[PDB]
């Protein structure tokens, strides 16, 4: 697996619907969909250690984890969570999340490197799955 690279988004499906499940009101959902059309993901992978920087026009966030080791990040709508990533196959990993405080939809994400050289991210809230596709810059 070489997830390492600078990835730029080419497709985003069901992102508004995901944010809706997560309780974001309609005007902000539209504004967020618009910010997603631009966004980039930078990955540095060494073995099962990952560094990920996600950036839009005005905001940037870093995720650091090792596969199989609990870490803390935030859900899509911004609520702090405990996360745990496991491999599902050679080139796909899955992250399950648990809220630090309170309750809400069951969230997760996956990241896959396809044979055609695309990165596929999925983000899930309950029954709704957002799929985003990236290519290397
Ligand atoms: C492996 C890559 C991951 C886990 C990327 C996660 C990216 C997000 C959770 C970004 C979500 C966004 C918003 C919450 C609002 C603006 C649009 C996005 C897509 C940057």
From Swiss-Prot:
Record has Cytoplasm as a keyword: yes
Annotated all-trans-retinoate binding sites: 132-134
Coiled-coil parts of chain: none
PROSITE patterns named in the record: FABP
Biological process per Gene Ontology, one example term: embryonic forelimb morphogenesis
First-listed, main subcellular location of the protein, grouped into a coarse class: cytoplasm
InterPro entries to which the protein is assigned, alphabetical: Calycin, Fatty_acid-bd, ILBP, Lipocln_cytosolic_FA-bd_dom
Highest taxon in the source lineage: Eukaryota
Recorded consequence of changing residue 29 to A: Loss of ligand-induced nuclear import
Induction behaviour: By retinoic acid.
Pfam families: Lipocalin
Compartments (UniProt record): Cytoplasm; Endoplasmic reticulum; Nucleus
GO molecular function, one term: fatty acid binding
Motif (Nuclear localization signal): 20-30
One Gene Ontology cellular component: extracellular exosome
Post-translational modification: Sumoylated in response to retinoic acid binding, sumoylation is critical for dissociation from ER and subsequent nuclear translocation.
Keyword annotations of the record: Cytoplasm, Endoplasmic reticulum, Isopeptide bond, Nucleus, Retinol-binding, Transport, Ubl conjugation, Vitamin A
Cross-link (Glycyl lysine isopeptide (Lys-Gly) (interchain with G-Cter in SUMO)): 101
Family label: Belongs to the calycin superfamily. Fatty-acid binding protein (FABP) family.
Quaternary context: Interacts with RXR and RARA. Interacts with importin alpha.
PANTHER family, per database record: FATTY ACID BINDING PROTEIN
Described purpose of this protein according to its UniProt entry: Transports retinoic acid to the nucleus. Regulates the access of retinoic acid to the nuclear retinoic acid receptors.
Record remark on domains: Forms a beta-barrel structure that accommodates hydrophobic ligands in its interior.
Protein name according to UniProt: Cellular retinoic acid-binding protein 2
């Amino acid at each position: 697996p070489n997830f390492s690279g600078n990835w730029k988004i080419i497709r985003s499906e069901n992102f508004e619907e995901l944010l809706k499940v997560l309780g974001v009101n309609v005007m902000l959902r539209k504004i967020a969909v618009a910010a997603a059309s631009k966004y980039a993901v930078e990955i540095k992978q060494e073995g099962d250690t990952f560094y990920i920087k996600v950036s839009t026009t005005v905001y940037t966030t870093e995720i650091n984890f090792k596969v199989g080791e609990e870490f803390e990040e935030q859900t899509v709508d911004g609520r702090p969570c405990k996360s745990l990533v496991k491999w599902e196959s050679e080139n796909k990993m899955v992250c399950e999340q648990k809220l630090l405080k309170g309750e809400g939809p069951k969230t997760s994400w996956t990241k896959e490197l396809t044979n055609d050289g695309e990165l596929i991210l999925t983000m899930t809230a309950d029954d709704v799955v957002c799929t985003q596709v990236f290519v290397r810059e």
